[PDB]
Symmetry: D6
Subunit: 166 residues, 12 copies
């Protein structure tokens, strides 16, 4: 039970890392090339796209993945240099859990659960309101939901382990 | 007989992995660049293509390959950390077989056995119905049939081994 | 005499693999981008190209290379797991020879020995018959002839070894 | 207290290097392709872009990262060749700190803290003043602020260690 | 004297291999994209370019490099499998020398010593004679001369060694 | 004093190699794509660009880097094969210094110290004289000056070591 | 009363002739130039326009005007050549009235009372059904109604005169 | 006084007719060719222009000019055929005055006194609201005001004559 | 009867002349501008159109109209100069009738009774067979039939008069 | 002397009318078609041209010509209707002279004596200031000067006659 | 016999004048707009067309028609002013005949009897030889032959009259 | 002799007027549309064309024709108003001769005797010098020479008459 949780967490971490590394970059290759808007004003596309996607999904996910692994690096380097251990273990576990929960909440509040095909853009220099068409909405939505589920499972396992330790 | 089946399964797994890794990406490089439709309405191409191919073949196959290999990773990590084995072996074999059968059925119900050259698209903003032309139908069809045959052979071997174990 | 044949076969296999891996991919990089036809009908290019080159040369050659190496993998994995050997050796050699001969015959019946520069395309939606111009005919022809010669030499060596063993 | 500082510095260095190497290159892939200006004069784009971004962010950051690691290489090679050590250690630490502070000040005086979307270009051959639209302002601004914060933390840690040693 | 020649030959071989691998591909990346002709007939570009460069320089040089190294592979594999040596040594030296001389003569008779900027193309479907403009003539000429000099030095050293052995 | 010089030289060599390998290709990716001229004559761009940049900077720098390292390879291979040493050491040092000085002088006489934005092209087929606009002048100028300074420092160190040895 | 009818008829005839001659030609100058359809198939515009407007309004109105004036020419030429008069007068009046009524009925059954802006075209070679946009619908509708009213008034006056004569 | 009014009216009528005939057509020659809108939707131009200018100025003015001259034609033809005169004179004058007043009021309520340069168009198929730019606003405004003044003077003179007659 | 025929002939001649002069030119204004073909070969349009319409309808009809009126001019000038009359009258009438019959037969054998929308063109430089789309088929067909009927009526009247004279 | 002035004035009036009617329209045929501006903003051309040429020269000159001839029409119609003469003559002469002087002053204050080739346009929607190029400056300038001289001569003659009458 | 000749000549002159005036301009309206050549060099069209058609047919025919009628104008004006007659008549007839014969010979030597569709143009700036396609060859050829026949008939009649007079 | 000269002058005047009226406009219809230059700078065409042809030939010739006929109008109007004659006759003859000579000299000094096909334009905004290609050089040259010859003949006849009068 308690020992299994660590194995499950490690396997899930490896699985999510592999998924993000393999099927992450190529899906978002043509995000801006295929983004088009129904207007003739030069420079409307850039402003509308920037308003639509302030920070791409892949950037946020890669940053989260790199950030959640800092405690392991700190522990490994401390152990290597050594050659309050319980205090360090507790502190690192608590910090990892807090960071993961915060990142999950931020992700939920940033992107939501859908990527609508049509967007309304009304920023300078675009005149009045214009309509812009997104590329690949369905695949992006599926990937969003999948990543959210994986993160939720990770958070649940971490909370269970923390509760068990007490 | 029984011992040979494991070797055949491993060889087939390696072969399919190599095929997907080598002749998987470059075939689907220009899926959206060369997809064209007979209309002048801006944004019709994106919607029609999204309706035509919700999730590309390569993403589904890569996800299936990664998912079917999780039990091996779990077994290896558990064995490494160790330094009910029969129960774990039976459970992971059963889970792998069930996952493979489910994925095969899902693949059959998603794509079928053909990739027609011409498609009819009647989604917003395209007015009424329009005709769109796919790129590389024959090669995609051949690859679909080949992958289906490989998956069927794998399922048959797994079922035979499970029946033998009893 | 007999002992030299194995070394010659291994060297030839390595040489052909290196050639296919090094000068294979980039020669066929712009097969579809530079393929043009003399018409204005949208979608004629896709259908005409698909009719011209059902399965590209590189896919066929890579598949053949991967397929002809399965017996070695099977033998190696069986030997590793072990720690009728003569029967297994004979069976694997015979199967390899049969597969190679079949693949050579299929290649000869598929592509032939030339790649003409001009092609006549009369498939829907192209109206009546149209003329399409291929890219890089001479280099493709030279590569075809070279690969055919290499495969013929391999087949000759395998047949000689099989006859010697009897 | 003081001992943990070295571990924190090493972890931060690894983290910043990983971030720059992973999420740095592809963000600035289309800096010039998507840079457009509202004019018809040929060659205005080149001059205006060159005036807008004399030296891109990524080149500066890579150069800084490479430069701040020379003292470690010098120390390692000197130690290897050997097989006033304290004086050498003090000199290398002081030089590293001075270089880092100088680079941080230069970065602050070069780019600032914002990347405006609109720019006014009045260089030859562009007639009078023209307006040019930048691509991806928000993500670049976020990256700038993040790198500045990381560099500030590194400088603070180095100054604290130097004060502790004295 | 005699012993130095082997070291010189090995160093020259490594140097030429590195040069071809590093500054070989990127120079010839845009050979066909930037090749333009002064006409409006569709398909003239393909035929004229194919007539201009039947086989690119890089393909010929890579093939020569791979072909001249087969004797070393044969010797190494024979020695490995062993665990008439003089006869094999003499035979492989003679074969290498003959192959190198033949390849050098073929290169001289194929391309010559220059790459003219302007070319005259009079092949179907181009009407009458047309003029086409090559890309990067000077750099290609310099590379041709450099490779010819390197090959000449290699041939001279091989001939000297063969004469010394007698 | 004298001993530190070797460490400084090795560190500088590694630093310059890393700089050229990392920030070398990216800057010169679009040298010809973004080079434009103010005319309508087909083929003027190719001739004008070829006249502007006979041999790009990166090719020259890579060739120099590879050439200056041949003596080390020769020494290492000779030492390995062995298992007048002073004469060989002196000879290879002298040759390295001479080659470096010659390459530096050639670089100075080829490119100079600036890359002007505007160029005047008067070669066939361009009629009379035309004006062409370069891409990224400032960054190229900075890189030129930086490489010149690094080469000067290397030459100074080599001359100092040679004088010390006498 | 009876005498006034002839004056009113003549004035109305002159008025309609002047209107058709002055504001007729230039209103329909750009009927085909500004007619556009939402498709890329070549030749769809011609077929769709031909289906939309088999015979333009101006042709029909000019033909009617010329045809209704033949009896006057016949009467004038007969009178001139002369140098049953009542029978000729009655016959030509009856024929004029019948022709006018027939032409009015034909006009009503041909065009109706409106010119919709949007039209649906499904004729070869247009694929499936396409939408085409007409130019100047409102002005054409107003002109149609005005001409219909004028023709109705003329018919009423002619019928009244015929009834009065008895 | 009373006799002068008729001369003034005739002179003004001739002057306005000459103005409309000479500077009427060519001013409005390119009304639709130079009308442009800021959008990419096909067919938006036609609908937006039709909404902007239902009936052009020239058509209305020509129709008014032709309509106000019918009484003179009726009087002339009646006099010619003759070879209650006061009643006919009074009736024709009253009808002419009433028609002129009605046409002036209609003109005022239709077009107003200005022709703005920018218009907002929100009709199908144009998506949402778009902005369209008119051609030659100032000249059209001046012509409108001039014609209104001429019509007002004519109405004033006619009213004065009618009052004088009593 | 005998006298009325001349009046009918004169009226019909005037009517046909007016029709040809009024609704003849502007119908055929854009015969070549709107003629399009489905190909990319330059110059195919000119050859295909020339093959489709050797001599336009309007030229033939104008020439026929001018030719059929020469006898009247000859008679008038002879009468004027005078200041065998029956022989001259008979000769001119017979010649006019013969010319009209010949022209009618030629017209029937040239154009026929229809103007198909689609045409097949296989003349140099057009490659193989191509399809071209005509403009305004229905209106041209109606005009053809109308002119044929008018010419037939004229021929019938002339034959009747000739038979009556005997 | 006094009597000759009338003949000179009439001849000059006829000459100017002929010049304006013959060489006036064709020069100003392409005023707006060939007017171009150095920008990409849609609708900038219309606003800039409208600001450059509020009322074209030809409209002003035609209006002046028509206006200066009203007194002659009034006198002729009054004389015709008649079948204080000195008072009418004096009034008409004074009014004609005043109108001509006012029109000349207005022309001088409107256009001046030159038509510069380059213009600076800074009206909405044109961003900032843009430069626009006029068509045919020299011919327009010559015509302006010629018309000004003719008008000056007419004014001088009219003033001389008025002074003579006293 | 002789008397009829004058009538025939006058009728033929009127007929040819009418033909040239009616069906002369519209045929040659788009001579240069539809003239196209197979090249990309700017300015080749102008030079090639100028070489193809130095002086168009219509200009030559109009000039000939005007020139051949000068003697009649001279005779008429001399007779009018009067209010050696035989000598003047003979001189004018002889001069007219000589001019007509000279013009016919010049026409034959200029254009010939055909207008080939394809032309070869090899004038500056066109490089080498290019092929250009003419518009409307058949109709132009027919018109040429018709005009030649008419001129021949006129010359024959004039020669017959001159011989008769002697 | 003397009497004939007047008739010759009148006939020549009528002939030149007819030539200028008939073959004057059609030749110069596309002077600016077909004028092209070899550059991409916007607005270069306008400036270069304006420099090439400050005042077109047709404007100058029409102005000369109108100016040379003023004396006849003055004489006719004076004679009509009449209902020193020798003095007026002599004065107007002398003025006509002087004006004609001055206009001929001006024409010779303006245009010369040729219209070259290539022109060099070096005016703002065109950068450096550019080459521009004229349209229809040969026909314009022929027309120039013809008009010069006609004017010379007129001048010779006028001088002869003036000398005869004495």
């Amino acid at each position: 039970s308690t020992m299994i949780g660590r194995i499950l967490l490690t396997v899930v971490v490896i699985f999510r890392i592999l998924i993000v590394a393999i099927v992450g970059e190529t899906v978002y290759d043509d995000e801006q090339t295929m983004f088009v808007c129904n207007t003739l004003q030069p420079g409307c596309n850039q402003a509308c796209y920037d308003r639509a996607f302030p920070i791409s999904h892949i950037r946020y996910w890669v940053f989260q993945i790199i950030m959640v692994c800092t405690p392991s690096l700190c522990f490994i380097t401390y152990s290597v240099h050594q050659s309050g251990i319980s205090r360090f273990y507790i502190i690192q576990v608590v910090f990892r859990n807090a960071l993961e929960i915060g990142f999950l909440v931020g992700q939920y509040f940033l992107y939501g659960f859908s990527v609508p095909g049509l967007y309304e853009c009304n920023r300078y220099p675009c005149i009045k309101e214009v309509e812009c068409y997104v590329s690949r909405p369905t695949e992006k939505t599926v990937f969003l939901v999948f990543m959210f589920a994986v993160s939720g499972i990770c958070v649940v396992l971490n909370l269970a382990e923390l509760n068990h330790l007490g």
